[PDB]
Scaffold this active site. Structure first.
Site, PDB file in Angstrom:
ATOM      1  N   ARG A  48      11.339   3.241  -0.097  1.00 41.85           N
ATOM      2  CA  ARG A  48      11.085   3.060   1.455  1.00 41.85           C
ATOM      3  C   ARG A  48      12.579   2.578   2.136  1.00 41.85           C
ATOM      4  CD  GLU A 103      -2.897   7.291   9.028  1.00 44.58           C
ATOM      5  OE1 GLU A 103      -3.643   7.144  10.120  1.00 44.58           O
ATOM      6  OE2 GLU A 103      -2.701   6.910   8.058  1.00 44.58           O
ATOM      7  CE  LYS A 127      -2.705   4.142  16.515  1.00 41.14           C
ATOM      8  NZ  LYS A 127      -3.467   5.105  16.271  1.00 41.14           N
TER       9      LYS A 127
END
Length: 709
Positions: free
Chosen positions: A443, A238, A453
């Site tokens: 991961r 993003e 975030k």
């Protein structure tokens, strides 16, 4: 012995074709000489002669006029010192024009590029240079252009480059310019395609679960014309996100696999969601990628492909594989069997802004592996988009998007974190478009770390942390500010491994790698926080200090000789015990006098000796520097998210936090130091220049300890 083969067999063994060998054989002088060359070569090789060495011996045999030097040139070709066509061409030029017959090895070797290495980057740049030189004519003539000029001009810049490497680079760069002719071990060895057992470009059909449709082979044919068989990967963050240590595994895997396999990697920003720009995060992503040592072949955005994504969505409807739904959101959708034409009509109506957000949706028509029904392809959103503004009020979902963008950008290896591969394939095959291979890796996450975030922006909202770049965070930008070197983070990712699962790990394992890089890279200078004044009752009235201790081959820097030197209030003791002590370069400085303030504030000292005690660190004529010392952000070294079930990850905010020093004293070696420069503070640990440090008001950060236990 190849010397015992018939000439026909010998020559095909050296790598001549059957046709070239039957010709060569009619040539007596060439056959005898070629045979002679090969006999001598196999003699001092102790081996069978490979094809590449063979072709060169052929060249030698067929062109050497001066037979006298044959054993000379053969020895070079054998020991692979001459292993390139223009090297052989230069040695032959040298042999003519040097009948002397005691030949100067050094003159010859230099004149023939004997040791010279030509890197890919060099060929890349020579080729790029030639392309720019001809770009207008290239763009118009396209594949009618004389590609000779490019190899020509490239050759003229790289005298000793292998011609095939030039040809390959030209072919590839011309492809990227023109588009299709439409008629533990090292990180880079670890990411070899062969090492990981990944498919070769164009052979997607060999991977597990891949579906071979009636178009697949043609599709891969087109794929190879567009790509030239090159490995293509992507990294898709993003544009308003924050990268953390897990993203380092992603960055190294995608750019690294590209790099390790002569391929390219796209930086494709996931901007499927319309939102205001936050320029600090965008540039930070770009920077972090560059910081870890990688360069995007191209920077793209999912929003670049909105037209094609939409067109494909329409085509899904036409094929009965998507429909417009009115559920709010699992319950079976009333609309999933509405007539196609109603779905064409309302999808257009979605696009024309005729529905409120959530009032209409486009859905794929399938059941997924995990039993999920009809995932959403498109939603209505009216926030203006940063790049397409108000051009769209409908936007594709994440999975639909990056799957079909992978197809558009002709990704060969779509590498992701867990895994809906079955549905990935479903989408490409439903539209009969090129279908990249999706491969999921595990991961990577670290204990005592929080990286959401929304949660990071509230660690900064509640002042528990100075900023989103604060060294108590495990974001990539933070670890850089904390003073970690890129090499360390990469070395870390290399060592963790290539193919795993969610593996939450302990931070010290990473800090381990930080230490091992700063040891060979961070020069040493001295300082302390708790400073004391020490007075010399003695000395003579520039004691050079090395840069790196365990290898002086790095150099030395001069530091002060003056008698007013300062030392650490953690070394100055009165009473006795089992273990203690109390200089690093000059003398031994015995305590003559001892002061004391109003209470027990030992305020200064007097010292006078020279030269077997225990040597310490000091600062004569010191520069005054700020130092920040940091603690563990979360009290639970293990995860804050409630496995512990603390009931709040904001409760786990460990009260120690930051230990600011407020301008203590430091060696004049840290004087011309710019931000992110790393040093060894000689008894305290490793420290790096915070980005708040001018030459005037210098600041340092406590990066890592010298040991653990």
């Amino acid at each position: 012995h190849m010397a015992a083969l018939d000439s026909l067999s010998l020559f095909t063994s050296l790598g001549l074709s059957e046709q070239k060998a039957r010709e060569t054989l009619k040539n007596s002088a060439l056959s005898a000489q070629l045979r002679e060359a090969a006999t001598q070569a196999q003699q001092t090789l102790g081996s069978t002669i490979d094809k590449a060495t063979g072709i060169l011996l052929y060249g030698l045999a067929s062109r050497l006029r001066d037979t006298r030097r044959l054993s000379f040139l053969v020895s070079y070709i054998a020991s692979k010192k001459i292993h390139t066509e223009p090297q052989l061409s230069a040695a032959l030029e040298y042999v003519r024009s040097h009948p002397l017959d005691p030949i100067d090895t050094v003159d010859f070797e230099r004149e023939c590029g004997v040791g010279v290495i030509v890197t890919p980057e060099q060929i890349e740049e020579a080729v790029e240079a030639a392309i720019n030189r001809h770009r207008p004519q290239l763009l118009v003539e396209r594949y009618h252009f004389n590609m000779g000029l490019l190899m020509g001009e490239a050759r003229a810049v790289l005298k000793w480059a292998d011609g095939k490497m030039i040809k390959n680079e030209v072919d590839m760069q011309v492809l990227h310019l023109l588009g299709p002719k439409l008629e533990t071990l090292s990180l880079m060895e670890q990411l070899r395609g062969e090492a990981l057992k990944f498919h070769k470009p164009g052979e997607n059909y060999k991977t597990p679960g891949y579906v071979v449709t009636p178009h697949t082979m043609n599709l891969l044919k087109q794929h190879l014309e567009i790509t030239g068989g090159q490995v293509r990967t992507r990294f898709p963050p993003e544009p308003n996100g924050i990268l953390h240590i897990g993203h380092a595994k992603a960055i190294n895997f995608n750019f690294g696999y590209a790099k390790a396999n002569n391929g390219i990697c796209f930086l494709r920003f996931d901007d499927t969601n319309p939102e205001k720009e936050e320029a600090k995060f965008f540039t930070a992503i770009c920077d972090m990628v560059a910081w870890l040592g990688y360069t995007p072949y191209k920077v793209t955005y999912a929003s670049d492909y909105f037209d094609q994504l939409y067109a494909w969505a329409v085509e899904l409807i036409r094929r009965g594989l998507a429909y417009v739904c009115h559920q709010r959101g699992t319950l079976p959708s009333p609309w999933r069997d509405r007539p196609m034409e109603e779905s064409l009509l309302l999808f257009e109506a979605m696009r024309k802004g005729k529905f409120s957000e959530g009032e209409a949706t486009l859905r794929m028509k399938l059941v997924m592996e995990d039993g999920k029904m009809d995932p959403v392809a498109y939603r209505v959103k009216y926030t203006p988009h940063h790049r397409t503004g108000d051009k769209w009020c409908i936007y594709p979902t994440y999975d639909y998007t990056h799957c079909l963008c992978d197809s558009i950008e002709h990704i060969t290896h779509s590498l992701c974190t867990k895994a809906r591969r079955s549905s990935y394939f479903w989408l490409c095959n439903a539209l009969d478009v090129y279908c990249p291979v999706q491969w999921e890796y595990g991961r990577l996450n670290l204990h005592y770390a929080v990286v959401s975030k929304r949660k990071i922006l509230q660690l900064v909202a509640t002042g528990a942390v100075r900023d989103w770049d604060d060294p108590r965070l495990f974001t990539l930008t933070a670890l850089r500010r904390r003073g970690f070197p890129p090499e360390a983070i990469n070395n870390f990712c290399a060592r963790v491994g290539v193919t795993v699962a969610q593996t939450t790990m302990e931070p010290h394992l990473l800090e381990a790698c930080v230490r091992d890089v700063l040891n060979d890279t961070a020069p040493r200078a001295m300082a302390v926080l708790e400073s004391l004044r020490v007075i010399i009752t003695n000395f003579p009235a520039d004691i050079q200090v090395p840069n790196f201790p365990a290898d002086e081959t790095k150099g030395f820097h001069q530091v002060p000789f003056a008698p007013i030197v300062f030392i650490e209030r953690t070394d100055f003791k009165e009473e006795p015990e089992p273990g203690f002590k109390r200089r690093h370069t000059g003398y031994v400085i015995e305590l003559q006098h001892v002061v004391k303030g109003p209470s027990g504030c030992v305020e200064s000292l007097e010292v006078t000796c020279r030269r077997p005690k225990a040597f310490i660190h000091w600062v004569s004529q010191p520069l005054m520097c700020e130092v920040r010392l940091y603690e563990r952000l979360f009290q639970h070294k293990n995860p804050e998210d409630p496995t512990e079930v603390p009931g709040g990850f904001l409760s786990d905010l460990n009260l120690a936090s930051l230990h600011v020093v407020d301008a203590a004293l430091v060696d004049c070696s840290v004087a011309l130091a710019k931000p992110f420069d790393k040093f060894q503070f000689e008894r305290l640990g490793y420290f790096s220049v915070d980005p708040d440090s001018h030459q005037g008001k210098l600041v340092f950060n406590r990066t890592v300890t010298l040991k653990e236990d």
